[PDB]
Amino acid sequence: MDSVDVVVIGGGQSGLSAGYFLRRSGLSYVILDAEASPGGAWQHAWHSLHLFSPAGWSSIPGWPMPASQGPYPARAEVLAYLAQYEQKYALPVLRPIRVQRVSHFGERLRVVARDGRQWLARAVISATGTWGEAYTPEYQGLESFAGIQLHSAHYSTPAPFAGMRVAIIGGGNSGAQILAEVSTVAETTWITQHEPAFLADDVDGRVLFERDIVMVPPVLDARARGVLAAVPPPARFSPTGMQWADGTERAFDAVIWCTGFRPALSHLKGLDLVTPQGQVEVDGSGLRALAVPSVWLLGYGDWNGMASATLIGVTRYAREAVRQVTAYCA
């Protein structure tokens, strides 16, 4: 039981941002990350992933992302930037540490690791991202589908789907991007709930910040190859594929689920903080939990801050959260 003013749970860009401001405050604190290496959920994105904005529009507080040389920074660059960032600021990051549980300890909070290490914190900033909680919807007959199934979370490479009939389900950025790539080797069907919405060709992801899906080069190359049409969801799944309410069938060898994530919040279960919808109720700042005021949330998505779940978006909230925690411990 090291006592610290603030425990930051998660050491991705979100935790790193919190850590940038906690440095500039009086407070003692620690960043606890489960990964083997720095870079957060980026270590788990497919090989070809680039960001949808230039380096300069993908920097977190203070030291900006080094200059990269394409239009858009490669996966490896985010990784490197995140790791250099930790050093530059000598951020107190402990990794690998899986936090099992945050629980009550009087006015403070006890943070417990899978291996028995413990902190006692006046405040906790939960910054554990969404990747660990990949969401797959529930469709009739799905368990009797005989082909291949993976989430976008585990998508890596197009080679495995070569020569197949593949269904890509979900119309976010992941769908459009995975569809783009996989379709260069497989017959592809894009299955989306709503007609997929595209930003203009002459604009990138920065537009989301200044405020649906970005025309990055592979996606542009896909529109040209005539592959970006969607179909609405089937009524159910058969062993060999899907069926629509109008009777229509399609066989598929594989299905790639691009149907989103939820907050990785299993470490706050039993604090009664997690809503049914996989969130937590927050005050008007969007950052401090209603039910337990010692607990802050950072980076999760719009429900937690408009555009908080992006590299450029996170900064605002990081500063805001840390100013509220700074006041709180004085």
Cβ atoms of 129 and 12 closer than 8 Å: yes
- Name the pairing type of β-strands 230-231 and 187-191: parallel
Distance from C-alpha of 92 to C-alpha of 203, rounded to nearest angstrom: 37
At 271, give phi and psi (nearest 5°). Answer: -80, 5
Among 19, 54, 61, 129, binds ligand FAD (CB under 6 A): 129
Among 24, 47, 88, 98, binds ligand FAD (CB under 6 A): 98
User: Would you give the DSSP letter of residue 254?
Assistant: E
Contact call for residue 132 and ligand FAD (CB under 6 A): yes
Contact call for residue 158 and ligand FAD (CB under 6 A): no
Of the two residues 227 and 311, which places its CB atom closer to ligand FAD in the complex?
311
Contact call for residue 296 and ligand FAD (CB under 6 A): no
Q: What is the sign, positive or negative, of the torsion defined by CA atoms of 174, 179, 185, 189?
A: positive
Q: Where in 241-280 is the site for a second copy (CB under 8 A)?
A: 254, 256
Q: Would you say 99 is a known binding-site residue? A: yes
Q: Which stretch binds a second copy (CB under 8 A): 14-22, 76-84, 146-154, 276-284?
A: 146-154
Q: Would you say 210 is a known binding-site residue? A: no
- The tokens for 283 are 């005050």
Q: Would you say 98 is a known binding-site residue? A: yes
Among 52, 85, 119, 317, binds ligand FAD (CB under 6 A): 52
> Under 8 Å CB-to-CB from 295, ≥6 apart: which residues?
102, 109, 123, 124, 126, 268, 271, 273, 280, 288, 289
Of the two residues 126 and 234, which places its CB atom closer to ligand FAD in the complex?
126
Contact call for residue 58 and ligand FAD (CB under 6 A): yes
Where does residue 278 fall: left (phi above 0), alpha (psi -120 to 50 degrees), or beta otherwise?
A: left
Contact call for residue 99 and ligand FAD (CB under 6 A): yes
Cβ atoms of 79 and 72 closer than 8 Å: no
Q: Would you say 90 is a known binding-site residue? A: no
Q: Which residue ranges make up the annotated binding site? A: 13-14, 33, 35, 41, 52, 98-99, 309, 311
**Interface with a second copy by CB under 8 A: which residues?**
36, 103, 112-118, 146, 148, 150, 154-157, 159-161, 254, 256
